[PDB]
């Protein structure tokens, strides 16, 4: 099937600029109480989630240097340790990961 006539710009504007086609404004945007950047109420903050991934990647790189190869997953718990810290009373018999960096403020030691 081919068009019988050419549709005018007046007809096209009513279709292209219809409110259904137009972008809907979002009302679920608020500022992150931690860093102040924008975020959605149902989505984790991008800035806050990014700094967690950067630290998580560093931790996982340390784990790879200790196992020294695949198929060497430990059968014990794991503990992340920073500069100026020692293993705790409850962190006994676990695999400690030493980090040459100060413990982040948002990272709460447990």
């Amino acid at each position: 099937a081919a068009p019988k006539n050419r549709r005018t710009i007046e007809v096209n504007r009513c279709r292209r600029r219809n409110p259904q086609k137009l972008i809907k404004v979002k009302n679920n945007i608020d500022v992150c109480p931690e860093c102040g950047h924008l975020k959605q109420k149902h989505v984790l903050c991008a800035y806050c989630y990014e700094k967690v991934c950067k630290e998580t990647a560093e931790i996982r790189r340390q784990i790879g240097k200790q196992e020294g190869g695949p198929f060497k997953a430990p059968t014990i718990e794991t503990v992340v340790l920073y500069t100026g810290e020692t293993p705790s009373e409850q962190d006994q018999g676990k695999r400690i990961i030493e980090r040459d960096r100060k413990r982040p403020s948002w990272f709460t030691q447990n």
Binding site: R16, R17, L22, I23, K26, I29, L38, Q40
Partner: protein
């Protein structure tokens, strides 16, 4: 090609009289040859048209369209340009006055079809224009009420004369 948008930032008005009111700042900024469709870019420019400078950035940050990130970079450098060069005190006291997109130069390639046929496909490029005016965004026009409709209809009945006579 035409580049009148850039020259609109070089017009200098005469100094104001003491009795004259504060004239809001006008900032014209644009980006040329954006690899995006002017039809698709229009919905992004229409969305932020009339919004505040900070409100517009909130909509463009969580929008999934590719041009949303392109427009956001234009606003960020235009907001910085307003304070740095156009003597704007508060960077957040801006609203989008004019936000439109224009067709750019497009290359022509060949799209091969079946049966030895072909179709010319263009690599569409578009421009984006934005105008910043210092001051709070104008309040939205209230919906016309029944009183206004009744006032207008009665006014129509009062302006009618006897036609085709003396």
């Amino acid at each position: 090609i035409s580049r009148k948008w850039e020259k609109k930032n070089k017009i200098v008005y005469p100094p104001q009289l003491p009795g004259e009111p504060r004239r809001p700042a006008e900032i014209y900024h644009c980006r040329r040859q954006i690899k995006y469709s002017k039809d698709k870019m229009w919905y992004l420019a229409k969305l932020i048209r009339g919004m505040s400078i900070d409100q517009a950035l909130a909509q463009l940050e969580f929008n999934d369209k590719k041009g949303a990130k392109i427009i956001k970079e234009v606003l960020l450098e235009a907001q910085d340009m307003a304070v740095r060069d156009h003597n704007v005190e508060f960077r957040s006291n801006l609203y989008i006055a004019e936000s439109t997109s224009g067709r750019g130069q497009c290359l022509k390639r060949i799209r091969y079809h079946g049966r030895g046929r072909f179709g010319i496909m263009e690599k569409v490029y578009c421009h984006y224009f934005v105008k910043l005016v210092e001051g709070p965004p104008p309040p939205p026009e209230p919906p016309k009420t029944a009183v206004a409709h009744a006032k207008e209809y009665i006014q129509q009945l009062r302006s009618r004369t006897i036609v085709h006579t003396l």
